[PDB]
Design an enzyme around this catalytic site. Structure first.
Site: not given
Ligand SMILES: CC(=O)N[C@@H]1[C@@H](O)[C@H](O[C@@H]2O[C@H](CO)[C@@H](O[C@@H]3O[C@H](CO)[C@@H](O)[C@H](O)[C@H]3NC(C)=O)[C@H](O)[C@H]2NC(C)=O)[C@@H](CO)O[C@H]1O
Ligand SMILES: CC(=O)N[C@@H]1[C@@H](O)[C@H](O[C@@H]2O[C@H](CO)[C@@H](O[C@@H]3O[C@H](CO)[C@@H](O)[C@H](O)[C@H]3NC(C)=O)[C@H](O)[C@H]2NC(C)=O)[C@@H](CO)O[C@H]1O
Length: 392
Positions: A127, A51
């Site tokens: 990822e 940004e």
């Molecule tokens: C270090 C590592 O790999 N990081 C993982 C994270 O990706 C992850 O968190 C979520 O990250 C994404 C970006 O990767 C966030 O997107 C952004 O979210 C905010 C609003 O929530 C928005 O204003 C930003 O502009 C937006 N950007 C765009 C351009 O897409 C996302 O919100 C994160 N939120 C959540 C609830 O996780 C974390 C969490 O699992 O895992 C890291 O390891």
């Molecule tokens: C169709 C479906 O829901 N399939 C499930 C799989 O997705 C799941 O793997 C887990 O997926 C979720 C998202 O669906 C992962 O959570 C996400 O994590 C990222 C960063 O790791 C974060 O930025 C996202 O916000 C977050 N998503 C949500 C919706 O909160 C989660 O990390 C995956 N599992 C692991 C161990 O990493 C598997 C679970 O058994 O199968 C289905 O349930």
């Protein structure tokens, strides 16, 4: 030297309201050994800004400079720029890594991008690489990044840019995308994403980051713990000292199908209601969990998983507190891992005003205390949630 304290700063934390509002100056320069800036971005195969307000232009200081200004007060502090994350997805990494020309295009863009902005290294957060092509091409990307960083350091006579990566804990993800011995060799260190083990994508409650799996777990499900994941990376050929174990300053939430069935592995109808400040169903910052516990929520310590969860009505949150974090720090030492990584610096109780102990950064402060022997201050006491909050 010693144990690392690796803190992720997220640039979108700038947009939160009221108690949630966070800025680079809220970080104490001596809190972390490394600060990783999430995130940079990719445009036309080259390292670029997420940004415009991350950049400095027209007399207005950008977030990059304000984060890096912390090194003025603590010259030992290292900063890195992360590329990738959840939003970034995979396709841009697949394209950038697919050929030598695409890789080198990125690499020779990355070095001046980082140097011109006073970053000390690059953190790769793909990822996730998946399949045989990604698995090879990821190693090739890291290999060529690392050798280009080595060559630059020698030509400009400055300390070499660091190369790190954030890597998954799911065994299927690891096996599919990661040639662990080669990946570990080319990285300076490895940020193990030891969280998101369970969440609203599952039909029963589970903890965000259990140290050990509960006994009610299927033995497939038992693979899903901090302890199992860190040891899996070692078994696959990562040096123990290169493994920096992630610690979440957030929890994952569920809505219980029945508020009377509230233990771990209880039926859930979906994610918990969104927090006021993070505004996302299934997720709460640590300081949002604190508000719950200070307003009628019940606290449970699970002595199998060595982590707490909180219940309020049909709302269930698995999170980390000062107790679970200290115990994980002891486990880090007992297992000789390289240190702790934090997602994120902006969801700890950074103001010190929300959780009740009047300590700025209680969780990360605890990490630094346990690992680097630095006190959080004169009368800094852990909140004893078992006394403060209700019980079941
Ligand atoms: C270090 C590592 O790999 N990081 C993982 C994270 O990706 C992850 O968190 C979520 O990250 C994404 C970006 O990767 C966030 O997107 C952004 O979210 C905010 C609003 O929530 C928005 O204003 C930003 O502009 C937006 N950007 C765009 C351009 O897409 C996302 O919100 C994160 N939120 C959540 C609830 O996780 C974390 C969490 O699992 O895992 C890291 O390891
Ligand atoms: C169709 C479906 O829901 N399939 C499930 C799989 O997705 C799941 O793997 C887990 O997926 C979720 C998202 O669906 C992962 O959570 C996400 O994590 C990222 C960063 O790791 C974060 O930025 C996202 O916000 C977050 N998503 C949500 C919706 O909160 C989660 O990390 C995956 N599992 C692991 C161990 O990493 C598997 C679970 O058994 O199968 C289905 O349930």
């Amino acid at each position: 030297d010693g144990y690392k304290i690796v803190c992720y700063y997220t640039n979108w934390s700038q947009y939160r309201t009221k108690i949630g509002k966070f800025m680079p100056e809220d970080i104490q320069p001596e809190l972390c050994t490394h600060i990783i800036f999430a995130f940079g971005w990719l445009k036309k195969g080259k390292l670029s800004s997420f940004e415009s307000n991350d950049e400095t232009k027209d007399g207005k200081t950008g977030l990059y400079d304000r984060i890096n200004a912390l090194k003025k007060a603590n010259p030992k502090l290292k900063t890195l720029l992360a590329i990738g994350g959840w939003s970034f997805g995979t396709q841009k990494f697949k394209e950038m890594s697919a050929t030598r020309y695409a890789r080198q295009t990125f690499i020779y863009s990355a070095i001046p991008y980082l140097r011109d902005r006073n970053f000390d290294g690059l953190d790769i957060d793909w990822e996730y690489p998946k399949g045989g092509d990604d698995k090879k091409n990821y190693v090739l990307l890291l290999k060529e990044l690392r050798e280009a960083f080595e060559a630059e350091a020698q030509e400009v006579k400055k300390p070499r840019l660091l190369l790190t990566a954030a890597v998954p804990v799911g065994p299927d993800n690891i096996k599919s995308g990661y040639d662990v011995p080669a990946v570990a060799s080319y990285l300076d260190f490895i940020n193990l994403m030891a969280y998101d083990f369970h969440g609203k994508w599952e039909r029963e409650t589970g903890h965000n980051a259990p140290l050990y799996a509960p006994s009610s777990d299927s033995e497939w499900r038992k693979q899903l713990s901090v302890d199992h994941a860190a040891h899996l990376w070692v078994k696959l050929g990562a040096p123990k000292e290169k493994l920096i174990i992630g610690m979440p300053t957030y929890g994952r939430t569920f809505t219980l199908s029945n508020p009377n069935n509230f233990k771990v592995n209880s039926p859930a109808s979906g994610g918990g209601k969104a927090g006021e400040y993070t505004k996302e169903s299934g997720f709460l910052a640590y300081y949002e969990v604190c508000e719950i516990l200070r307003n009628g929520g019940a606290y449970v310590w699970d002595d199998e998983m060595k982590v707490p969860y909180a219940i309020h009505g049909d709302q269930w949150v698995g999170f980390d507190d000062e107790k679970s974090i200290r115990n994980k720090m002891r486990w880090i030492k007992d297992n000789s891992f390289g240190g702790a990584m934090v997602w994120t610096v902006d969801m700890d109780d950074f103001s010190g005003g929300v959780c009740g102990g009047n300590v700025k950064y209680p969780l990360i402060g605890a990490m630094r205390e346990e690992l680097r022997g630095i006190s959080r201050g004169k009368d800094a006491k852990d909140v004893d949630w078992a006394s403060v909050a209700a019980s079941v």
